[PDB]
Amino acid sequence: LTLGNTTSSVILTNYMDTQYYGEIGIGTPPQTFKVVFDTGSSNVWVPSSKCSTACVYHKLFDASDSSSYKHNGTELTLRYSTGTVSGFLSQDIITVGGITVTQMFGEVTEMPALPFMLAEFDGVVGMGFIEQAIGRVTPIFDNIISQGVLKEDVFSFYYNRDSSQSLGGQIVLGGSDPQHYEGNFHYINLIKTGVWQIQMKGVSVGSSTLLCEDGCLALVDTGASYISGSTSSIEKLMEALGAKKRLFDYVVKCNEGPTLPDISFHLGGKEYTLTSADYVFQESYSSKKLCTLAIHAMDIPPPTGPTWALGATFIRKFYTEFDRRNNRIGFALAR
Ligand SMILES: O=C(NCC1c2ccccc2Oc2ccccc21)[C@H]1CCCNC1
Ligand SMILES: *[C@@H]1O[C@H](CO)[C@@H](O)[C@H](O)[C@H]1NC(C)=O
């Protein structure tokens, strides 16, 4: 008897406004892992006890301590923006919030030091669609929908601003937390099912629509730390903001930061505005200091890209709901 009224929540940890991670349990008894819940990918993976370099810094899964483990052994390679991971498939019981699902995940044996020694999380829970899943492995949310236990076939994200004994964030499975948003949701449908990507009708700097006038794509990526666009777009945008290209990021003089113009994204006939307080890492106010912007360039290869990606920078401002039943994304202002 699976009566659909569940709304299981996961408390997230905010690390530097770049990494938001919660706790999952794998096995019988459960082995806990710090995971990033990523709408940009669809595979679940944790480091393996069978791991031979970043592995030393993370919690490892030992199949030999799980009574519910079922072998598979299929080799698997998962490629992200900063680096690639490698391992094999295994099956066990995964606990997320108060939900228990039999999930096929990847035990990772090859995990490079760069970028994984910078990661504060052990693994990744992909919140994308089977269409994006490596080796056509059923994603965890698809398996939760199959249980027929949720209030609604939706999940929502809340990413807070770094503070202190405060909530870093929160994923709700089955609904949305009204304590974390103001007013009502505005929905935008997905271009196609299979990707958490919507149409964008322009990017503005101040009150002038500078970019994406003839339309472009926007990927709603909980796994991305920043807002990203193509090199072309980010060059135009940063020139408008008067930001200079440093080696890995764009900076402005720290004094110039509070006077930077609003950046607006046109999504579903509504403008979603980020003020300077939302995209500048205001670490100092000095003229002698350089301050980083929470916006970078990233070229996403086809079929997904070229696209913009609305990461933690966007999500922190706008509470996000991902609707599987209706294939649409909802934004309400975060609280
Ligand atoms: O690579 C991504 N995000 C970066 C973020 C990350 C998210 C998911 C998987 C691996 C991963 O690597 C690191 C390592 C250190 C710090 C942050 C990250 C994107 C790639 C496309 C799908 N979403 C996540
Ligand atoms: C591993 O899992 C796949 C499903 O992705 C299945 O088709 C395959 O037969 C399994 N292989 C083994 C060795 O159990």
Side-chain angles (χ1 to χ4, degrees):
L1 194 82
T2 52
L3 304 143
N5 210 48
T6 329
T7 51
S8 205
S9 88
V10 190
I11 293 321
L12 307 179
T13 294
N14 181 354
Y15 175 72
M16 309 275 286
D17 284 355
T18 63
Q19 294 178 43
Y20 295 84
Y21 54 92
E23 186 231 278
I24 62 154
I26 322 183
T28 313
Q31 289 176 44
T32 68
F33 304 92
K34 290 160 185 183
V35 286
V36 138
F37 295 87
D38 172 33
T39 57
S41 69
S42 324
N43 289 89
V44 180
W45 69 259
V46 291
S48 204
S49 57
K50 275 154 247 163
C51 188
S52 48
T53 327
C55 281
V56 195
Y57 298 113
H58 298 290
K59 293 304 182 292
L60 318 179
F61 177 72
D62 203 337
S64 79
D65 288 307
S66 186
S67 63
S68 46
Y69 166 76
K70 315 273 186 291
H71 163 89
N72 177 278
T74 295
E75 281 154 75
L76 178 87
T77 290
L78 299 167
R79 50 167 145 130
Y80 303 106
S81 51
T82 10
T84 298
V85 294
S86 265
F88 58 92
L89 287 185
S90 292
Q91 180 197 106
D92 217 321
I93 281 162
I94 302 183
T95 300
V96 42
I99 307 178
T100 307
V101 76
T102 294
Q103 186 65 37
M104 188 87 37
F105 65 93
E107 291 199 48
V108 160
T109 59
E110 287 109 285
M111 193 181 186
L114 213 76
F116 306 97
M117 80 158 187
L118 307 158
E120 294 287 310
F121 53 89
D122 309 307
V124 172
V125 172
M127 300 299 287
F129 300 80
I130 195 154
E131 285 98 331
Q132 301 159 279
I134 299 311
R136 276 180 159 196
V137 185
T138 301
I140 196 169
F141 202 69
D142 282 60
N143 282 328
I144 299 169
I145 277 166
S146 286
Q147 289 190 213
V149 67
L150 297 165
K151 204 185 157 180
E152 285 306 328
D153 302 338
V154 319
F155 58 90
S156 64
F157 280 78
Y158 168 68
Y159 283 175
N160 197 1
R161 308 183 172 93
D162 206 21
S163 314
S164 165
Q165 192 71 90
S166 306
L167 186 69
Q170 178 189 75
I171 318 126
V172 172
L173 300 165
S176 287
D177 190 359
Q179 282 287 282
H180 290 303
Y181 68 92
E182 275 174 72
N184 317 280
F185 281 100
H186 291 105
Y187 301 93
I188 308 94
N189 291 17
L190 306 187
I191 288 128
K192 74 199 155 299
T193 188
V195 194
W196 286 119
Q197 196 172 52
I198 58 170
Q199 182 74 13
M200 180 150 67
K201 310 137 92 179
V203 187
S204 308
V205 174
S207 92
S208 55
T209 304
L210 183 93
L211 278 149
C212 182
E213 303 189 48
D214 298 317
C216 63
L217 308 162
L219 182 84
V220 191
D221 196 10
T222 60
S225 301
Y226 314 101
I227 286 163
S228 70
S230 67
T231 316
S232 328
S233 308
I234 302 304
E235 277 168 357
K236 301 181 195 105
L237 175 78
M238 293 298 188
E239 187 179 308
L241 295 161
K244 299 140 177 193
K245 190 186 171 182
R246 196 155 80 168
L247 194 72
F248 300 147
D249 42 32
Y250 280 86
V251 299
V252 291
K253 288 196 163 296
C254 292
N255 51 311
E256 291 169 343
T259 74
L260 278 179
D262 292 353
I263 307 171
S264 285
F265 305 85
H266 200 204
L267 316 168
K270 203 206 161 288
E271 292 278 340
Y272 289 92
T273 299
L274 293 208
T275 84
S276 54
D278 304 304
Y279 68 92
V280 180
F281 287 104
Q282 212 66 63
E283 283 172 276
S284 174
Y285 287 94
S286 156
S287 160
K288 296 171 155 199
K289 294 284 158 210
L290 287 171
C291 278
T292 300
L293 310 179
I295 303 165
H296 75 66
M298 205 190 276
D299 303 293
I300 300 140
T304 314
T307 186
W308 283 76
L310 308 165
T313 310
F314 190 88
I315 298 156
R316 256 191 306 273
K317 184 67 176 283
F318 306 103
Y319 187 100
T320 310
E321 185 175 275
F322 303 84
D323 194 334
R324 282 298 304 276
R325 171 141 227 267
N326 291 298
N327 293 318
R328 65 186 190 165
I329 299 172
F331 304 113
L333 187 77
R335 190 224 283 190

